[PDB]
Design an enzyme around this catalytic site. Structure first.
Site, PDB file in Angstrom:
ATOM      1  N   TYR A   8       0.808  -1.204   0.000  1.00 42.67           N
ATOM      2  CA  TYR A   8       0.000   0.000   0.000  1.00 42.67           C
ATOM      3  C   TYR A   8       0.865   1.289   0.000  1.00 42.67           C
ATOM      4  O   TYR A   8       0.644   2.188  -0.793  1.00 42.67           O
ATOM      5  CB  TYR A   8      -0.876  -0.010   1.240  1.00 42.67           C
ATOM      6  CG  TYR A   8      -1.663   1.261   1.453  1.00 42.67           C
ATOM      7  CD1 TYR A   8      -2.764   1.542   0.670  1.00 42.67           C
ATOM      8  CD2 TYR A   8      -1.289   2.186   2.444  1.00 42.67           C
ATOM      9  CE1 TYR A   8      -3.504   2.688   0.847  1.00 42.67           C
ATOM     10  CE2 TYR A   8      -2.067   3.333   2.675  1.00 42.67           C
ATOM     11  CZ  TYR A   8      -3.142   3.585   1.867  1.00 42.67           C
ATOM     12  OH  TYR A   8      -3.887   4.720   2.058  1.00 42.67           O
ATOM     13  N   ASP A  60       1.255   6.907  10.622  1.00 44.54           N
ATOM     14  CA  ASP A  60       2.210   5.808  10.742  1.00 44.54           C
ATOM     15  C   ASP A  60       3.542   6.107  10.060  1.00 44.54           C
ATOM     16  O   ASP A  60       4.590   5.633  10.493  1.00 44.54           O
ATOM     17  CB  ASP A  60       1.603   4.517  10.197  1.00 44.54           C
ATOM     18  CG  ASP A  60       1.123   4.676   8.796  1.00 44.54           C
ATOM     19  OD1 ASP A  60       1.970   4.662   7.888  1.00 44.54           O
ATOM     20  OD2 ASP A  60      -0.086   4.844   8.618  1.00 44.54           O
ATOM     21  N   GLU A  76      -1.601  15.211  10.134  1.00 45.91           N
ATOM     22  CA  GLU A  76      -2.254  14.113  10.833  1.00 45.91           C
ATOM     23  C   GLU A  76      -3.000  14.713  12.044  1.00 45.91           C
ATOM     24  O   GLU A  76      -2.442  15.521  12.817  1.00 45.91           O
ATOM     25  CB  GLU A  76      -1.189  13.095  11.242  1.00 45.91           C
ATOM     26  CG  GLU A  76      -1.559  12.092  12.342  1.00 45.91           C
ATOM     27  CD  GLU A  76      -2.659  11.174  11.941  1.00 45.91           C
ATOM     28  OE1 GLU A  76      -2.479  10.419  10.940  1.00 45.91           O
ATOM     29  OE2 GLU A  76      -3.708  11.230  12.617  1.00 45.91           O
ATOM     30  N   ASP A 100      -6.766  18.873  11.774  1.00 41.28           N
ATOM     31  CA  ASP A 100      -7.735  18.379  10.791  1.00 41.28           C
ATOM     32  C   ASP A 100      -7.310  18.834   9.382  1.00 41.28           C
ATOM     33  O   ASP A 100      -7.196  20.053   9.126  1.00 41.28           O
ATOM     34  CB  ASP A 100      -9.139  18.920  11.119  1.00 41.28           C
ATOM     35  CG  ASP A 100     -10.251  18.182  10.361  1.00 41.28           C
ATOM     36  OD1 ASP A 100     -10.056  17.728   9.206  1.00 41.28           O
ATOM     37  OD2 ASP A 100     -11.346  18.047  10.924  1.00 41.28           O
ATOM     38  N   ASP A 127      -3.792   9.762   2.569  1.00 40.78           N
ATOM     39  CA  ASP A 127      -3.690   8.465   3.239  1.00 40.78           C
ATOM     40  C   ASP A 127      -4.663   8.425   4.414  1.00 40.78           C
ATOM     41  O   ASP A 127      -4.248   8.423   5.571  1.00 40.78           O
ATOM     42  CB  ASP A 127      -2.243   8.145   3.676  1.00 40.78           C
ATOM     43  CG  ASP A 127      -2.117   6.787   4.411  1.00 40.78           C
ATOM     44  OD1 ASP A 127      -3.064   5.969   4.395  1.00 40.78           O
ATOM     45  OD2 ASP A 127      -1.057   6.505   5.001  1.00 40.78           O
ATOM     46  N   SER A 128      -5.960   8.408   4.094  1.00 40.16           N
ATOM     47  CA  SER A 128      -7.031   8.386   5.092  1.00 40.16           C
ATOM     48  C   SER A 128      -8.356   7.894   4.544  1.00 40.16           C
ATOM     49  O   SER A 128      -8.641   8.066   3.358  1.00 40.16           O
ATOM     50  CB  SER A 128      -7.278   9.778   5.662  1.00 40.16           C
ATOM     51  OG  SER A 128      -8.531   9.775   6.351  1.00 40.16           O
ATOM     52  N   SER A 129      -9.154   7.273   5.426  1.00 34.76           N
ATOM     53  CA  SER A 129     -10.548   6.912   5.136  1.00 34.76           C
ATOM     54  C   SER A 129     -11.495   7.886   5.831  1.00 34.76           C
ATOM     55  O   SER A 129     -12.395   8.457   5.192  1.00 34.76           O
ATOM     56  CB  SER A 129     -10.861   5.495   5.612  1.00 34.76           C
ATOM     57  OG  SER A 129     -10.456   5.332   6.960  1.00 34.76           O
TER      58      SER A 129
HETATM   59  C1  LIG Z   1      -2.160   5.878  10.038  1.00 35.74           C
HETATM   60  S1  LIG Z   1      -2.998   6.056   8.486  1.00 35.74           S
HETATM   61  C2  LIG Z   1      -4.600   6.861   8.485  1.00 35.74           C
HETATM   62  C3  LIG Z   1      -4.521   8.100   9.372  1.00 35.74           C
HETATM   63  O1  LIG Z   1      -5.394   9.144   8.972  1.00 35.74           O
HETATM   64  C4  LIG Z   1      -5.538   9.984  10.125  1.00 35.74           C
HETATM   65  N1  LIG Z   1      -6.669  10.898   9.930  1.00 35.74           N
HETATM   66  C5  LIG Z   1      -7.974  10.538   9.987  1.00 35.74           C
HETATM   67  N2  LIG Z   1      -8.773  11.605   9.751  1.00 35.74           N
HETATM   68  C6  LIG Z   1      -7.957  12.671   9.533  1.00 35.74           C
HETATM   69  C7  LIG Z   1      -8.140  14.116   9.216  1.00 35.74           C
HETATM   70  N3  LIG Z   1      -9.374  14.656   9.094  1.00 35.74           N
HETATM   71  N4  LIG Z   1      -7.031  14.875   9.081  1.00 35.74           N
HETATM   72  C8  LIG Z   1      -5.780  14.380   9.210  1.00 35.74           C
HETATM   73  N5  LIG Z   1      -5.535  13.084   9.488  1.00 35.74           N
HETATM   74  C9  LIG Z   1      -6.567  12.198   9.657  1.00 35.74           C
HETATM   75  C10 LIG Z   1      -5.818   8.955  11.216  1.00 35.74           C
HETATM   76  O2  LIG Z   1      -5.699   9.501  12.552  1.00 35.74           O
HETATM   77  C11 LIG Z   1      -4.830   7.869  10.839  1.00 35.74           C
HETATM   78  O3  LIG Z   1      -3.599   8.125  11.494  1.00 35.74           O
END
Ligand SMILES: CSC[C@H]1O[C@@H](n2cnc3c(N)ncnc32)[C@H](O)[C@@H]1O
Ligand SMILES: CSC[C@H]1O[C@@H](n2cnc3c(N)ncnc32)[C@H](O)[C@@H]1O
Lengths: 272, 272
Positions: free
Chosen positions: B62, B87, B107, B138, B156-158
């Site tokens: 990934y 991470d 992050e 955020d 890199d986020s859901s």
């Molecule tokens: C470790 S990989 C996915 C990461 O996305 C981060 N993450 C989730 N939502 C947000 C956001 N709105 N802004 C920044 N980072 C985020 C999570 O805390 C997680 O560490």
């Protein structure tokens, strides 16, 4: 509702689970435990000795790739053998080809065939085709005894040096064999063993990967064996007729793409 | 030994499980539940709100694909943003590029960053690189406020229409964004939604698939956004220098192959 969970010494430390809407059929056959259940999200599921054999949701991925890879590379395949494949997924995809004159299937467990005809009608529908002939026997014995030679052999089963010799001899001079062959995520040593057996006889051995969620690690490979140096990575035909309008995974571009493997896998197999 | 099992309304009716050698750390952060355990077969595992974030065994698949797809297409990327990615897997792959001058990471959860620095040293090693700057906030707020523009943004986020506008505006005229984007096996409607948001602004939106056993259904896609009609399916460089000798998944051929999607997926997205 209960859950079905698959555990195995073959993939220790991991498990995959499906929620059960309803258990549909169970029996101990002469060969294996057989379980059929409706799952909540993946449709009906065939389980053999606690290992998922297929689900209605994703089966087309595996049966399309396994069938259409060799069959678009073989020029005018007339006689095709399926080894294993009692569910009839491969046969269903084979019957789409008007050029095929005969489809022999050697499945050791007739219970699998009859369970598929009863519970999985859209998978086992090819059994009604007059070109299909069923042999209830060990493929090892079948292959030693068969007199005909085949244009394509599809080994739809979970294999040793003697077995590949039998496949080589059961193929036409320009024949192809594709065999189910492990997940690159868990059994690289096996893939290397299998590639080594195949290379003893076949001038061209190639490995392809299929994405399919209900196989362990969400993928399964196809060991591809050719007698000509040209191989199975490039199709010689497009699947344009009305019989192939329904295809859900396979296409001309995916065919070649499936042979593009992760770097760790190429490194492992490079010196075989 | 106990087992970790991941359930979710996001993939109902299915579950994936790993055997626990040892639980290593747990906490409720300001944002989410955090769990770190050594598994028996997949190495160390990061779990966030009960969803596997990464394992040492397959993470390179990934993090390599997400990073090297845009970074081999961008000609001389100087400034790169990672959104999420606490991470540090992406950052680790970014640092391999000598041309990069700055790596901003936004992050929201600093606990993720510190847990990765402690428990996952070979993943979080890029944090020591002097080009890396950390913003604990955020990404929605970060992107509204940032003054710089980036050559590449890696989400890199859901994820909504306003979010993609912010990404578009935070990119250079010839900039690229890649974002984590669902499994084609379970959330086609979401993929269609995301593609629709992206196409409002980006002239070229493409979708790629990564094979990775510990994401649900054993795969995850990359939503690829370009401002030029040329897109992200073909690399402009080969990764030949000593920094990339260690690559385990990504290569020049796999890059393009990952955009060759199953026929059912192309049919669904064709009219967007
Ligand atoms: C470790 S990989 C996915 C990461 O996305 C981060 N993450 C989730 N939502 C947000 C956001 N709105 N802004 C920044 N980072 C985020 C999570 O805390 C997680 O560490
Ligand atoms: C349904 S797909 C896999 C099938 O391979 C069949 N099979 C397993 N071993 C053999 C064998 N030695 N010969 C023929 N078929 C087999 C199994 O009974 C199963 O139906």
């Amino acid at each position: 509702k209960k859950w079905f969970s698959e555990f195995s010494i073959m993939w220790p430390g991991q498990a995959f689970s499906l929620k059960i809407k309803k258990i549909l059929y169970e029996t101990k056959s002469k060969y294996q435990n057989v379980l059929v259940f409706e799952s909540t999200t993946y449709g009906k599921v065939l389980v053999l000795d606690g290992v998922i054999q297929l689900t209605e949701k994703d089966e087309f991925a595996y049966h399309e790739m396994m069938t259409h890879v060799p069959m678009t590379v073989s020029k005018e395949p007339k006689n095709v053998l399926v080894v294993g494949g009692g569910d009839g997924g491969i046969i269903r995809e084979l019957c789409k080809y008007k050029s095929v004159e005969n489809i022999d299937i050697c499945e050791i467990d007739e219970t699998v065939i009859e369970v598929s005809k009863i519970y999985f009608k859209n998978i086992s529908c090819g059994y009604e085709d007059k070109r299909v002939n069923v042999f209830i026997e060990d493929a090892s014995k079948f292959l030693e005894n068969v007199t005909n030679t085949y244009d394509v052999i599809i080994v739809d089963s979970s294999f040793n040096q003697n077995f590949y010799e039998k496949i080589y001899n059961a193929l036409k001079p320009n024949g192809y064999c594709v065999a189910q062959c492990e997940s690159l995520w868990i059994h690289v040593g096996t893939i290397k063993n299998m590639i080594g057996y195949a290379k003893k006889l076949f001038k061209k051995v190639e490995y392809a990967n299929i994405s399919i969620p209900t196989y362990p690690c969400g993928c399964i490979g196809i060991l591809c064996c050719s007698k000509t140096d040209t191989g199975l990575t490039k199709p010689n035909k497009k699947l344009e007729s009305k019989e192939f309008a329904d295809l859900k995974y396979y296409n001309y571009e995916n065919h070649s793409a499936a042979f593009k493997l992760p770097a760790f896998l190429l490194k492992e197999i490079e010196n075989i």
